[PDB]
Every structure is written in C-alpha cells, then in structure tokens.
Design a protein around this ligand. Structure first.
Ligand code: NAG
Ligand code: NAG
Ligand code: NAG
Lengths: 189, 178, 13
C-alpha cells in the first residue's frame, strides 16, 4: 500500500511539580508530527504554533465558555486524575533484582567483562557503581543506559571491562528510591 | 515531578484511532475502539480505578473531523514515513531452561502502522505473544513493544521481523543464546 | 476512582 497517509494527534498534558502544588495544563494539536496550536494554562488562551493553526486559535479564543473550561482543567482534569492515580503510579515502587555475571568482549577471550544486571525496578532513576577491593572503579564502565520494558519496569546492564585476578573481590552497588540503603552484590573469581 | 498525558490519534485512509493515558512514559490504559472497552496495562490498575470508554469514542470522532479539516488546510500534504529502529532483548539474564521473555522494541517511527512477526528458527510463532498499542514519544513519533515468552535453549534462534512503509525491506533483528 | 477524559473542540470548518 502506497496510498498517502494523514495523521492527527492530540495530547492533553498535565505537568505536576511537587505533587499537585504546582500544575501546568497543555492541550496540544499535531498534524503528522507538527504541533500547530496549543492551549497553555500559563497563558489561558490558545496560541498558533505554526501558521496552520491560526484559524483554530482565533476561532477557539472567540469561545469564552471553551476558554473557561480550559482555564479550569488544571483543577477539574489534572488535579483530579492525579488524585485518582497517585497510589499506583506516583507511589509505585518495585525493587531492583541484581545479578552479577562474567562475560567476554571479543568472543572467546578469557572473561574480561563483569556484568551488573539490574532488572524489574520502578521508578527509573537508579545509580549503579562498581568497586574493586573497596575502591570505586570509574574507568572501564560501559552501560546499556536505562531501558524501559514497557510493562512498568526498567532494567539496565552495567559492565566493568576488567581482567579479574584471583582473590580480588568486585562489588556492584545499586542505589534506587525504593531502597533505604544501597544494595550491594559481590563477585570473586 | 511527573507527567500524565492523554494521547489520541486518528489516521487516514486507514480509519485507525487510538486513545491512551501515559504516566511518565508508561501506559496506564488504552481504549479498545472495536470493543468499546477500557484496557488496563496492568491488571491491578482496574481494581484501583475506572474509566468510561465512551468518552474516548467521542474524542476520536472529533479527531477524525479535525483531520479532515487539517488535511484540506494543508493542501493534502501527506505524512513523510520515518522507519523504526528495532532492538531485541530479554527481560532478565538468560539461563538455560529458565523461562524468560524476549522483548522487541520498535521505536521512532511514523505513521503508527507496523507488521511485526516473531520467528523461531525462521518460522513465525504466535503462541503466547503479546504487544502494546502505539505509544507516544515527545518528538511525536511512536514506540511499540512486542513480547515472546520462551524457554532458552542452545537449539533455538529468534528474530523479530518488522515491516513498515518507510523501510525498503523487512527489518529482522536477531537473538540467540551466548 | 474514575479518571476523566479531557474533551477537545472541533476546528474552524
Ligand atoms: C511542596 O509543598 C509542601 C506542602 O504540600 C511544602 O511544605 C513544600 O515546601 C513544597 N516544596 C517546595 C516548594 O519546596
Ligand atoms: C495552500 O494553498 C493556498 C493557495 O490556494 C495558500 O494560500 C496556502 O498558503 C497553502 N498552504 C499550505 C501549503 O499550507
Ligand atoms: C501489513 O500487511 C498488509 C497485507 O497483509 C499490507 O497490505 C500492509 O501494507 C502491511 N503493512 C506494513 C508493511 O506496514
């Protein structure tokens, strides 16, 4: 199918700063990928983002009842949905499962990668660090970055490029908002 | 410090429509348009809240009407296809004989139409597969996840195959044990 | 217990 496509998107966004103490509401309209008009609660009227949206800004701003509905959305839409969802979204906590395992950079070279695999956590902010015999190892660290699993969990792998020496002990340290204290996992050759 | 987005789209000529809520990049629910039903991303959520699916259908009808307007206002300028990037990973470190899930993450694409097949030793597989709807990105392209529960073995190789109108040929992304 | 959908207006016809 080579027929041309045409796409309309609308995103009604609610931005929360310190819970519901500071709330910004944005109504945004897009044609393909291009935002053409939006209602910002910081402004309290619609504004054309591109020339394509000028007739809608004008038209919609001439409707006083529409503006007043949208001027109220920080309260009747955003604060309301925040209250509905907070317990299982804002307050969702899911502990990181931590696994250390060795691996190889160039296939079939003695193990020279220690992998700290951190799985199934929520929310996303995490800090993973590596230690060799009590010293942080800051060189030789590469990571996948933060990966979203799409099921309200995250994972990340954090790798230490190293040539392990017998009786050296390596520690993977994980700090996350779900924990009261850092989680630590050790490995020895 | 958080963002809730009610994201909607309507696509011609396909007459496809979508309605979903996103919290910090995670889907809370979407509305199955055919079934007129709210579908929770996690089961648990349905016990903590509700949503009336009929509102979504009303919004989509406005989105369809606005698309017709904007299509003419644009002089029928169509969308430019942006092909996806695709990545295949597991949800947990892999152990022979330990059940796991392969994830196929399709991102940065538009329009929101894709064919995705999971392949085992080159043959399509459908048993136990699941998928998300199209998720919005901040750059107004889309993202999507497909899942395949599996038992790892040195005997099997997998690919996630993705077709999209911006690709010259299907993109296959490979996975195997090692 | 109920999430609210925000509605939107119809464009300049
Ligand atoms: C957030 O709001 C609380 C009261 O709800 C207040 O005590 C606190 O100072 C606020 N945080 C800021 C603005 O630093
Ligand atoms: C569409 O064409 C009209 C002339 O008929 C012109 O004024 C307008 O700028 C064009 N708009 C586009 C390409 O968005
Ligand atoms: C998916 O497959 C159908 C035929 O089954 C095809 O006509 C359609 O264009 C495909 N969509 C793609 C490649 O995005």
């Amino acid at each position: 199918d080579t027929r041309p496509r045409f796409l309309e998107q609308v995103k009604h966004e609610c931005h929360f700063f310190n819970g519901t103490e500071r709330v910004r509401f944005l109504d945004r309209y897009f044609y393909h990928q291009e935002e053409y008009v939006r209602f910002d609660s910081d402004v309290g009227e619609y504004r054309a983002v591109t020339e394509l949206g000028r007739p809608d800004a004008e038209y919609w701003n001439s409707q006083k009842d529409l503006l007043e509905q949208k001027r109220a959305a920080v309260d009747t839409y955003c604060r309301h949905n925040y209250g509905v969802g907070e317990s299982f979204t804002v307050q969702r906590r899911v502990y990181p499962e931590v696994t250390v395992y060795p691996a190889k950079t160039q296939p079939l070279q003695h193990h020279n990668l220690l992998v700290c695999s951190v799985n199934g956590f929520y929310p996303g902010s995490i800090e993973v660090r590596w230690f060799r015999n009590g010293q942080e190892e800051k060189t030789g660290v590469v990571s996948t970055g933060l990966i979203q699993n799409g099921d309200w969990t995250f994972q990340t792998l954090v790798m230490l490029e190293t040539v392990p020496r017998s009786g050296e002990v390596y520690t993977c340290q994980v700090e996350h908002p779900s924990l009261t204290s850092p989680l630590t996992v050790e490995w020895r050759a | 410090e958080h963002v809730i987005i009610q994201a909607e789209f309507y696509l011609n000529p396909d007459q496809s429509g979508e309605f979903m809520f996103d919290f910090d990049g995670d889907e809370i629910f979407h509305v199955d348009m055919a079934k007129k039903e709210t579908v929770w991303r996690l089961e648990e959520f349905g016990r903590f809240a509700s949503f009336e699916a009929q509102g979504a259908l009303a919004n989509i009808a406005v989105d369809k009407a606005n698309l017709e307007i904007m299509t003419k206002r644009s002089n029928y300028t169509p969308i430019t296809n942006v092909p996806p990037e695709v990545t295949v990973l597991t949800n947990s470190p892999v152990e022979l004989r330990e059940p796991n899930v392969l994830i196929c993450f399709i991102d940065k694409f538009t329009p929101p139409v894709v064919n995705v097949t999971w392949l085992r030793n080159g043959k399509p597989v459908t048993t136990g597969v699941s998928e998300t709807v199209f998720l919005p990105r901040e750059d107004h392209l889309f993202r999507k996840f497909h899942y395949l529960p599996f038992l790892p073995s040195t005997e099997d190789v997998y690919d996630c195959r993705v077709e999209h109108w911006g690709l010259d040929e299907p993109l296959l992304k490979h996975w195997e044990f090692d | 217990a109920g999430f609210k959908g925000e509605q939107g207006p119809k464009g300049e016809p």
